[PDB]
Amino acid sequence: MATGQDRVVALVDMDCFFVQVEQRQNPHLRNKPCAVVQYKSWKGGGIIAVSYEARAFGVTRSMWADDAKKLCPDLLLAQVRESRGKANLTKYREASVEVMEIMSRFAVIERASIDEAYVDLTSAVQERLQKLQGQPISADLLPSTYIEGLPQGPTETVQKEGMRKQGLFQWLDSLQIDNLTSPDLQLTVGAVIVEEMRAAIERETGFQCSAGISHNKVLAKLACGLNKPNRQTLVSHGSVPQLFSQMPIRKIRSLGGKLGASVIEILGIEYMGELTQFTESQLQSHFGEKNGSWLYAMCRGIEHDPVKPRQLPKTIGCSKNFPGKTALATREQVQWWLLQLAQELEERLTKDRNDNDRVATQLVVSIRVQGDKRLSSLRRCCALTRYDAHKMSHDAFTVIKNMNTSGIQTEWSPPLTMLFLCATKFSAS
DNA sequence: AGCACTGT
DNA sequence: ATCACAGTGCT
Ligand SMILES: Nc1nc2c(ncn2[C@H]2C[C@H](O)[C@@H](COP(=O)(O)NP(=O)(O)OP(=O)(O)O)O2)c(=O)[nH]1
Ligand SMILES: [Mg+2]
Ligand SMILES: [Mg+2]
């Protein structure tokens, strides 16, 4: 804990998740360059998930499918289901629940996104350590594990699986010889458990995933990306100095945006490791007490954000953009789409209440007007008393109708480029 | 409470 | 003209 080695934390991330879901359903897509796309009409659809075969051609997320086909002519495409005029992600939310439920059998999980979850293995590691007590850890228990930073020094060596094994052997040889620390043993056992977790996910869903194992959430997530796909990486406390010495600051979670850019600009540094030069007080003065404290500890491999026990989303939301000439202008238009959104929301809320024994109590309504730089022009709350689509849509209209700045009966102005309904403030029931 | 930021 | 979500922190 003084060196931030009290916990064993893992981050599991499903490999090209939406693709895997579609590839499981359509075997003709397996082991092929493939992507998942929503809305075929505009340039073949926007790509939101890309198999690794397709990545090898340069296909990326946030790319029009027509442009993707220019890079990858044999690219196959699965379409997001469309329901009530909009993209419907239910299939991937259900697939995500399959996975989370398996992970819960092993430990406390924090659902971080639709396709990844943090795991706190600290207690499971102790449990496992007293079983087989004193018995050595065989390389056969870690068949897909990389040890970041290894192999090193002097004493297969040209291909990747050979590299992995050498690094693992070096790690395990130093373990059983007492040349490593107690937290290093714990991470190793954590990694044995994460192998079993990943094998169970694949056996029971067909989905492959990658994992990071380390002492905190940031290092776990960083480690998870070092060896994708279908592999897991152990980032020990001792590997942090070399790992961070050339790690771009933007690669650390929460520094990929404006804050990270201002750390680079204000301090004149490029890599996470350079942050160790500064005093905590110096970092607090530039970035605030909380950010400074977090940065001072994080650049040394230390962070204390806990794995929250939260397997379910906190909100259930429903949105649609209306770009360009499709922006909503008549009142009958806003009311029709508000109803479409409200109807999908009701279905999902009803399923939620039956599955998870809880009810939302607040309806958040957000819109965007044509010509606003910000992603949201107005957010407004109202009570959510019944799971009734028509009420929610009327209430959503009631709380935005004052945005219309026009006189004509059947006209809305300025036109709306975005509607968003969100149920929140869940309570047991 | 409304908003900005950050992430998948 | 990507888009559809979702969580956290500030004031
Ligand atoms: N609509 C939309 N969906 C997204 C976006 N980013 C991700 N998703 C959806 C699609 C993704 O399938 C899922 C998980 O996102 P990741 O873990 O960041 N990428 P993946 O799991 O696909 O591949 P790997 O993890 O091996 O890099 O969330 C986005 O910008 N937009
Ligand atoms: Mg993923
Ligand atoms: Mg992910």
Residue numbers in the entry: 1 to 155, 159 to 432
Quote from the publication.
We show here that human Polη can efficiently bypass AraC embedded in a DNA template strand by incorporating cognate G as well as noncognate deoxynucleotides (predominantly an A) opposite the lesion. In both AraC-containing ternary complexes, Polη encircles the template–primer with its palm (residues 1–13 and 90–238), fingers (residues 17–87), thumb (residues 241–301) domains as well as the PAD (polymerase associated domain; residues 319–432). The palm domain carries the catalytic residues Asp13, Asp115, and Glu116, while the fingers domain lies above the templating AraC base. The thumb and the PAD grasp the template–primer DNA duplex at opposite sides, from the minor and major groove surfaces, respectively.
We crystalized the human Polη catalytic core (residues 1 to 432) with a template-primer 12/8-mer (5′–CAT(AraC)ACAGTGCT–3′/5′–AGCACTGT–3′) and non-reactive dGTP analog dGMPNPP. We refined this cognate ternary complex structure with the G opposite the AraC template residue to 2.4 Å resolution and to Rfree of 21.4% and Rwork of 17.7%. The AraC base pairs with the G base of incoming dGMPNPP with the expectant Watson-Crick (W-C) geometry. However, the C1′- C1′ distance across the base pair is ~10.71 Ả, as compared to 10.5 Ả for an ideal W-C base pair. Also, the AraC base is tilted by ~30°, which negatively impacts its stacking with the adjacent bases on the template strand. The AraC sugar assumes the C1′-exo conformation rather than the C2′-endo conformation observed in Polη structures with unmodified DNA. C1′-exo is one of the preferred sugar conformations for arabinonucleosides, and it appears to be further stabilized in the Polη active by a hydrogen bond between the “extra” 2′-OH on the AraC sugar and the main chain amide of Asn324 of the polymerase. Also, in contrast to the unmodified structures, the side chain of Gln38 forms a hydrogen bond with the O2 atom of the AraC base instead of the O4′ atom the sugar, and Arg61 (unique to Polη) adopts a single rotameric conformation to stabilize the binding of the incoming nucleotide rather than multiple conformations. Importantly, the 3′-OH of the primer terminus is at the reaction-ready distance of 3.41 Ả from the α-P atom of dGMPNPP. Thus, despite local adjustments in how AraC is accommodated in the Polη active site, the polymerase is well poised for the incorporation of G opposite template AraC.
